[PDB]
Each structure stands twice: as C-alpha cells, then as structure tokens.
Amino acid sequence: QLPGPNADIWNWQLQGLCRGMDSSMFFHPDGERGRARTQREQRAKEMCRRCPVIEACRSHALEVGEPYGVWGGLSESERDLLLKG
Amino acid sequence: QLPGPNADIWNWQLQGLCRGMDSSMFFHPDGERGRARTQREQRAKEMCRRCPVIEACRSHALEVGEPYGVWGGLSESERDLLLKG
Amino acid sequence: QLPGPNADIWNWQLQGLCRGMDSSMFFHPDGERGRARTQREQRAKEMCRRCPVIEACRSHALEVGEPYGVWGGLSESERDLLLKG
Amino acid sequence: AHHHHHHVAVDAVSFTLLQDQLQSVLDTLSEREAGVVRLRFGLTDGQPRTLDEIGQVYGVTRERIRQIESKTMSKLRHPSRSQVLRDYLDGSSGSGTPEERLLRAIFGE
Amino acid sequence: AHHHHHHVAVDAVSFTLLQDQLQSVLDTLSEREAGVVRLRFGLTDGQPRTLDEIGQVYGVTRERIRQIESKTMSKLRHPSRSQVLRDYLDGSSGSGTPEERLLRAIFGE
Amino acid sequence: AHHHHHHVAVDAVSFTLLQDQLQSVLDTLSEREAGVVRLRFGLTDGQPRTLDEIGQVYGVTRERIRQIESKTMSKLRHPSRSQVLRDYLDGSSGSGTPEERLLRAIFGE
Numbered sequence A, B, C: 001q002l003p004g005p006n007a008d009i010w011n012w013q014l015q016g017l018c019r020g021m022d023s024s025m026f027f028h029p030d031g032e033r034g035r036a037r038t039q040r041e042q043r044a045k046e047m048c049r050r051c052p053v054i055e056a057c058r059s060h061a062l063e064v065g066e067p068y069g070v071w072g073g074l075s076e077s078e079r080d081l082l083l084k085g
Numbered sequence D, E, F: 001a002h003h004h005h006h007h008v009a010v011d012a013v014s015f016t017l018l019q020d021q022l023q024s025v026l027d028t029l030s031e032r033e034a035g036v037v038r039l040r041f042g043l044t045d046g047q048p049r050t051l052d053e054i055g056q057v058y059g060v061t062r063e064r065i066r067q068i069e070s071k072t073m074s075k076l077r078h079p080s081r082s083q084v085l086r087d088y089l090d091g092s093s094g095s096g097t098p099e100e101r102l103l104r105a106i107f108g109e
C-alpha cells in the first residue's frame, strides 16, 4: 500500500471511467472564466454519473481531501461549500 | 532461489566437472559440420562420464529442457530423440 | 543495527558531548610532537569528564578496540598501557 | 541513459524512483506546474526554493504558488491519469525494462 | 563509471543487475548471439526488435534467429560458464566492489 | 549528477551507498588519509592497491600506511563526527533528497 492518508486509492481508481482521459476534462486551465468553466464541469460530471466507483471517488475527495478537480461528480466549489459552508 | 523452472540449478552446478572450461567444448560453433562435430561431442562426453553430478545434469536437460549443448553426457540429438522420437 | 563488533555504537554515540566538534580535538595531526600533543589530550579529556556517555565510550574503546584517538577520557597511550602493559 | 534512479523510504515503505518515469509524471502537468514542482523540491539542482522565490520566477504571489502546488498534487492523484504515478512509484519492479525481459527469457515464461 | 544498474522483480524475487556484470555475461557468447540478445530485449536502445527485424540485421531467417536465441539461453545456463550468470544475478551483494571492501574495513573482519 | 550509488550486503544487512555521501565522509579525513582509503579499496579506479604500492605513492613505509588506515577507521567511528558515517550508511532512506520531499508532498504530511 501507499504511506499516509492516500494509502488505499488504488483499491478503486483502477475502475474509474475517466482512466483513459486527459486531465483537462476534470481540471480547469488556470485562466478559465465564464461559460468555458461551467461547460467543462458538466462534461466531467456526465462521465461521473456513469462511473461505477463514483461513491468511492466522492468519498475520497470529501473525506481525505482533494481541493482541485472534479471528483465523484462534484465540482471544486460544490465540495468547498459542503466542507466549509 | 531463482524464479521459474530453473529455480534449483545452483544445487548441483557448483559441483560440475566442466565448471572451468570454455563453453566451446559443450556447444558447436554455428557452422560446424562432419568430423569436427562428432569429435567435439565425444570430448565433452569423456568429461561427463567422470562428473559427479552427471545424473542431475542429465535430468535437468531432459526434464526441465535444454535444447542445445552437451548435458549429462548426452548430445543435442540424443536428447531430441529421447524426448520426441 | 550494524554488522560486526561495532554493531551497537549508535546506542550511545548520539549522546556524546563531542558530537559537534571537529575530529582535531580528539586526534593528533600526524606530525605532532611535544607540548602540542599533551595540550590537545587534556583539552579532549576536559570534555569527556563532563560527558554523559563516558563509560560507554571508554568501554567501546577498550573492549571493542580503538587504537587511535581520545575515547572515554583516555589517551591512545593510556589505553595501550592498560591493554598490553 | 535510462539508469538514473533514487532509493527512498517513507514511513517504512521503500521506493525505487526512475528519472525517466518522473519525467513522464511531470509531462502530464502544465509547464508552470511542472516548473513549480521542480523548484519547490530541488529536482533542478538539489536545492529547494521558498514559495516567494518561486513566485519571483513566475511573476505571481506566494499564495498563487501555494495554490499551484495544491492543484498539482490533486492532478497527480486524480484517477484519470494516476496510472502514470503508479508506474513511477513501482519502479522497483523494473516492469517493461530490457533487463526484466532478459531475465524472463532466461528463467522461462 | 561502474554504477549503471537496474532493479527488477520477477515472480516476487528482486534483483540488482549491473551493466558491467551484464557485459561479462555477454562476453561469453558469440558476437552474433550477443547482438541478437541486445536487439531482442532492447539493451541497445530500450526498444525490443521482432525476430524478423533481427534476421534482417544478420541476413538470416526469423527461424534461425529463434534458434540462436534458444541456443543462447542454453549457453547461459550451462554449468561450464554459469558462474558468470550467478555473479550477475547476485549484483545486490556488491561482492568485490570498492564499497563492500570499505564497509568490511569499517565494520571489522 | 547525484545518482551514483552502490548496493552492498555485509553479513546479511543491505546498504545503499551514495557517492556524494561518501565524499562527505572522506572530507572529514586528512588528504593523505582519504587518499590511502581511495587507493586501498579501489575507489579511484576499481582496483585495490597493496600497502607497499600506497607507501610508494606517499613516500612512507608499508607499516606507516597500515597505521594511517587504522587511524582512519578510528576517526570514522569516533562520536565527534560519526553522524557523517551514519548518514552515508543510511543512504537507502533517501532522507533530504528531492524525491523524498516530493513523495512526502504527494502522500501528505
């Protein structure tokens, strides 16, 4: 296994639907603003809503902590609102 | 030990009589034909017939599989005839 | 641990008082003769006589064997006299 | 020509980490993200940089460099591309190297 | 200058394999046998070759290259010269290296 | 540029020994002591020298070289500077290397 809190990510990531894709579907380029941003997020989410390990992905991002990217069908700001309010 | 079917060759090879010799006494140069070939084989065999681990050498070559070289006092063709007929 | 007779030196060396110092307080330059020699030794010994692991240092040098340097508040010649007479 | 590697232990787990496989990990990042990683940990020259020194390089605040680092770590662990990380961390296996192929030929199967 | 080595695991046994000791193994082969090994497994440039590509190099059939490979593996395992292979596969021991001699001096005996 | 290292086993304990950390160990010795070590164990060129050959280099007797070697080993183990030796012998940990810092960033804490 890996050391630290991410010790067990390999248990589920090998089944993720996004496994082949470029990270660009799940992360915003640094400058991105307006329309492009939201259109990227909803594309990523359409994949998560078909993914068999969405629950494990969502749980990793919220409970172990991933500040950036779409994980588990949730955007960065969705997770920040859930965790910090 | 080693992985695979050759796992245990070190158990006996350290006692082989040929341990110091160049591989040329036991393997034919690629082009070799006629007299030279047979004269090489019988020289190799004279050594095997004095060797303390001849039985283990012969068993390795026939049962684990060595297609080339003189092993256990047997030539390549002798072993091919025994195994395939 | 380490292999060999020095297996356990780390058990005590981390508490030695000389831990920060240059080895020059405890070893004579190759050429050193007369006054300088003895003045080096007594300086080293003033430190050992304040050191919490002097007993372990002395025991290592005498029983495991360190031919050179001041160890345990003892000079090279002091240890040679104790061990060989 | 491919041999440069490092041995590291973190919390009593050991890793063999190949420079070529690290380069494959960094290739998945943006140019600025990969540069921040190289400066922050001293991959360029053995010497770590402070967040302010890196911000000087890229003309941004220390806080933006902190955010770039955080985003990079999320990127490296995301399931989309995390096989490149897995491959890097499993460098001790030698999988797909000339020597591993040779040994499998010698040993059979 | 002697340091190039590879770490590999085959069926959960680990090996440290030194380029200099691999060269000693290859030196026991004919020039064509050693060249077939280098091309087949990608020792020359990281890239394995097909049996047909190697046969193109040596002007022989794919089947002759298969036989050359088979003969090579028998040669490497034969008891006459198999100590060179043993030495290669035991590279993790560092036996006969400057650093192993130094450590034995520091540790005693 | 920092990668050169050797794997050695002595009495069934394994070591990873970095050339840069060996240089730090040798830096604590006198120039002649460090040179005797390099010649005696073959660090310069893979080839050990006899005590008489080394004495030829330094214009001293074989017995003086024996004493220089003995004094060196005492120096390396003395508690004053023995942390440099500890650091060298613990090279498998990768402590204070760019890759260990990177892995701790990826893994957290």
Ligand code: SF4
Pocket: A013, A015, A016, A017, A018, A019, A047, A048, A049, A051, A052, A053, A054, A055, A057, A058, A070, A071, A072, A073, D079, D080
């Ligand atoms: S839930 Fe989304 S981000 Fe997570 S593995 Fe599945 S597809 Fe990838």
Ligand code: SF4
Pocket: B013, B015, B016, B017, B018, B019, B047, B048, B049, B051, B052, B053, B054, B055, B057, B058, B070, B071, B072, B073, E079, E080
């Ligand atoms: S039987 Fe022949 S080939 Fe086998 S080890 Fe003995 S001498 Fe060598």
Ligand code: SF4
Pocket: C013, C015, C016, C017, C018, C019, C047, C048, C049, C051, C052, C053, C054, C055, C057, C058, C070, C071, C072, C073, F079, F080
């Ligand atoms: S007894 Fe002297 S030499 Fe030994 S550790 Fe203490 S101060 Fe250092």
Ligand code: NI
Pocket: D001, D002, D003, D004
């Ligand atoms: Ni290389």
Ligand code: NI
Pocket: D002, D003, E004, E005, E006, E019
């Ligand atoms: Ni190589």
Ligand code: NI
Pocket: E001, E002, E003, E004
């Ligand atoms: Ni080298």
Ligand code: NI
Pocket: E002, E003, F004, F005, F006, F019
């Ligand atoms: Ni070296």
Ligand code: NI
Pocket: D005, D007, E005, E007, F005, F007
């Ligand atoms: Ni290594």
Ligand code: NI
Pocket: F001, F002, F003, F004
């Ligand atoms: Ni290097």
Ligand code: NI
Pocket: D004, D005, D006, D019, F002, F003
């Ligand atoms: Ni490096």
